[PDB]
């Protein structure tokens, strides 16, 4: 009984992530996001322990639904004749990081440090749960404007984390690494680090560095805004053309530019309230 358990509100958005409606769980008035996905538009399918054939997105969301606030939490899901309905938590008030950067321009490095740090913790949580997001970008990051916490969303392009080469990709091309552009091959962790470099440049410069394939494989990062030497070095490290030259998550968080990060509450009070 999905119609009797939730009160469906206005449409929050639509696109590659299906159609997402605002909702309230009648049992406790908890704000939820109700995401509909058509079966005919599902690429990768998975199987739950019970053997039921569910979309891979449901499998990945369940594996990361540990309560860590850095990822969107799947609360429930339903199957319909031609679609799946996903019940997601809904923090309020929120704005995605794309709209945030569009309205504020390039972010102060103190704010970008706090945001980037939380994204790193969220991605570490995914990898620890065996999940590769494969579509890290500002559009897939929600900002809890009151708590100053970031949430990674839309696992619809993800996959189980493996140590062998990936040959499929359904994420965002301008965030994809040059080894995918050239050879249609990538490993999960080094590809994630590349997208994180694109994301970090996006935050401190106000837009992504590369729009065309030739720029992705070119290996030149021009800084259109004043960016500290420490931040520039971390970005260029993440955007190393050779995957093995890119830093690990530990090396990123140990980088001098990443030290003395603000707490989420401090981030909201200084930069969001």
């Amino acid at each position: 009984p999905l119609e009797s358990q939730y009160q469906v509100g206005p449409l929050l958005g639509s696109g590659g992530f299906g159609s997402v409606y605002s909702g309230i769980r009648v049992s406790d008035n908890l704000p939820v996001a109700i995401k509909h996905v058509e079966k005919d538009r599902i690429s990768d399918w998975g199987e739950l322990p019970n053997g039921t054939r569910v979309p891979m997105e449901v499998v990945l969301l369940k594996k990361v639904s540990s309560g860590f606030s850095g990822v969107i939490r799947l609360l429930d899901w339903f199957e319909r004749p031609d679609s799946f309905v996903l019940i997601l938590e809904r923090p309020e008030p929120v704005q995605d990081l794309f709209d945030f950067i569009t309205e504020r321009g390039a972010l102060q490095e103190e704010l970008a440090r706090s945001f980037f740090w939380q994204v790193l913790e969220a991605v570490r949580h995914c990898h620890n749960c065996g999940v590769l997001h494969r579509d890290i970008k500002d559009e897939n990051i929600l900002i809890d404007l009151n708590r100053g916490e970031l949430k990674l969303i839309d696992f619809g392009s993800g996959a189980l984390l493996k140590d062998t080469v990936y040959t499929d990709f359904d994420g965002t091309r301008v965030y994809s690494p040059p080894e995918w552009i050239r050879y249609h091959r990538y490993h999960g962790r080094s590809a994630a680090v590349w997208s994180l470099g694109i994301l970090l440049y996006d935050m401190v410069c106000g837009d992504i560095p590369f729009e065309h394939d030739e720029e992705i494989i070119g290996g030149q990062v021009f800084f259109r805004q004043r960016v500290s030497s420490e931040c520039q070095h971390l970005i260029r490290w993440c955007l190393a053309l050779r995957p093995s030259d890119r830093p690990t998550f530990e090396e990123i968080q140990n980088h001098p530019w990443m030290q003395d990060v603000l707490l989420p509450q401090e981030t909201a009070e200084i930069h969001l309230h």
Binding site: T102, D135, E139, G156, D170, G171, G206
Partner: peptide, 9 residues
């Protein structure tokens, strides 16, 4: 300079 979203896939 035109900043835009990029759909996935």
């Amino acid at each position: 300079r035109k900043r835009r979203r990029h759909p996935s896939g």
